Amino acid sequence: GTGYDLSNSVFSPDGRNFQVEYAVKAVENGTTSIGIKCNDGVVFAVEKLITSKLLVPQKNVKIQVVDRHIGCVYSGLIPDGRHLVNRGREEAASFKKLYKTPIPIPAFADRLGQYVQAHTLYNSVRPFGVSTIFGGVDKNGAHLYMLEPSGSYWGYKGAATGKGRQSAKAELEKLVDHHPEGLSAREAVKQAAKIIYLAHEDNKEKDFELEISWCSLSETNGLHKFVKGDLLQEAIDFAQKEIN
Amino acid sequence: DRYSFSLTTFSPSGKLGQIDYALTAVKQGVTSLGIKATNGVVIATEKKSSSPLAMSETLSKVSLLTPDIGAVYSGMGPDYRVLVDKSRKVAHTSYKRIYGEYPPTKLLVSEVAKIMQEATQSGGVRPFGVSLLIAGHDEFNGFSLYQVDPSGSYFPWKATAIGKGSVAAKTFLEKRWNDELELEDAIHIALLTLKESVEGEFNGDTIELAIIGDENPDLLGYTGIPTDKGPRFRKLTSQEINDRLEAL
């Protein structure tokens, strides 16, 4: 639809907002991000491409915490993801100020969805060029969401975004079939590492650094924490041996 | 809002295109008519259902604006509904709150016409796609019937019709209208004029009719103030319409 795609918030004759579909093309060009819901928590992982030797290892962190209990990871235009996370942090702070409890993950999800959907209402704004995987632990346990440029979000057992989304999604499907009782957080960390490595059997034009985070009632006291040191190296070893 | 500019503009021929297109929307609308008698005004319209499951009783095509002023429309129903709300509020805030009195029909019609005009010139809005027939009574001017068009131009009529059937209806009304017509005759002529333009089914469920007539002290809801007039606006029931149609 070459007539109706020049301006956000225009319906095409078939009812489509083409600028949102093009923002989705921006997402599909991004690196692979995944999320896994475990029996008491969520695991986030992201492919960080090593565009050169000169990038400082471990330093260009892509996962973001919101409040203390929400993790966010996104694929696409990284600055749009930072912008969305800044709004999320404002929303969480406002909720906790008025209601002293930490913002529930479904509430936070709707706050983000409304903000993203608002960027589809006017021609004076661009849609978000990110899809965001986010989640955490609240009083009702673990929740995992993936939010699209349209503002559409759903809860997921596992989620994948970016260039490797299809292979990741197939591996998450197998993981959900094989562990119907629910995966543990440490095993979910190992699986997330494997899945990111398998998704990087696409997009192999460059090397990559794995970044993992998690939020688990047992393993983190329901706080979002980065996976570092021994457990990260163990996850990388598991991923490499599962390939090699 | 970045649309601070007018969307209605003059063409080289001097047409305001959006206003002519709004009038085309009106002319495709369901037929409405009005007839002024010596002792009242009739306004009437077809109620076209969107579905056999819809409760047409829940959709009011005829609206009270004041106890003595009624409106009907042809064209875009939602625009009419929003204009009714604005007309009611402006009748209060621009007049009743100042003078303790409901506006005369002509002044409320002016206020509505102003609202409609502003949509033809202010930034970022289209015109309203409705034409209104506004019927009323006031102590000094008596009974009045006005048409307001999308431009916000308004004209007093003895009788008129608007919408798809308005040409045949206006010709029939020119045949039938006279200075000696009583309200019961005007209702009879209104029912005849709608019969010739309804899509077959013609009854008190497919017709909405209201009158501006005598004061109705039974509708006032209180007693003991002899100077407080009952409302002159009255929507006819479907049973009253059927009773009249059986005798038509």
């Binding site: - | 709150r97 100042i98 003078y99 303790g100 009195e101 002044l107 102590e139 000094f140």
Partner: protein
């Protein structure tokens, strides 16, 4: 308000109304003028305003504005009842930061011919200003319903004169309007 002084009285009669005021303009004890008429009219509706003379002038000019615009829009002169409502709403619009005034409306409705006064529609007599309590005493003693216009003139004039004689801040002449649907007569009274 009392800085300037002044009194207005209106009375209804048989198919008539009277409205009357003193003419003094003061500045506390100093008398400034005896040409400060407190009674205005807007078509056939008469408005007396007592109180602060700057507010009297301002409100007269404002009601002239509003009743001219009314006549232009409505294509008829305002009636006394409608004008009373207009006065009420215009004064309450300054409910905070008031005009320091006491309006008195008098007239005859063009259509019904009913005499009307307000300061409501207290139909016998209406009193405003510095000598209000003297005026209440006089009118409540002298007033009779359905006075003919000549007797109404005598009654309102004696009420005004005798009340004014006991008010220091009002007087130096009085004006009486006798209003009939066909005819308004202005009369000036000497004060002693």
């Amino acid at each position: 308000s009392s800085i300037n002084g002044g009194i207005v009285v209106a009375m209804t009669g048989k198919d008539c109304v009277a409205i009357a005021c003193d003419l003094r303009l003061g500045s506390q004890s100093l008398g400034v003028s005896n040409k400060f008429e407190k009674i205005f009219h807007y078509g056939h509706v008469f408005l007396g305003i007592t109180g602060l003379a700057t507010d009297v002038t301002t409100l007269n000019e404002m009601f002239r504005y509003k009743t001219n615009l009314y006549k232009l829009k409505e294509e008829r002169a305002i009636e006394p009842e409608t004008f009373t409502q207009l006065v009420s709403s215009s004064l309450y619009e300054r409910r905070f930061g008031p005009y320091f005034v006491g309006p008195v409306v008098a007239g005859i409705n063009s259509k019904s011919g009913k005499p009307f006064i307000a300061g409501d529609e207290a139909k016998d007599f209406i009193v405003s200003g510095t000598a209000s309590d003297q005026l209440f005493g006089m009118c409540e003693s002298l007033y009779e319903p359905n006075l003919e216009p000549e007797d109404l003139f005598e009654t309102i004039s004696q009420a005004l004169l005798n009340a004014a004689d006991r008010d220091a801040l009002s007087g130096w002449g009085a004006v009486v309007y006798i209003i009939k649907k066909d005819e308004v007569v202005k009369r000036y009274l000497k004060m002693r």
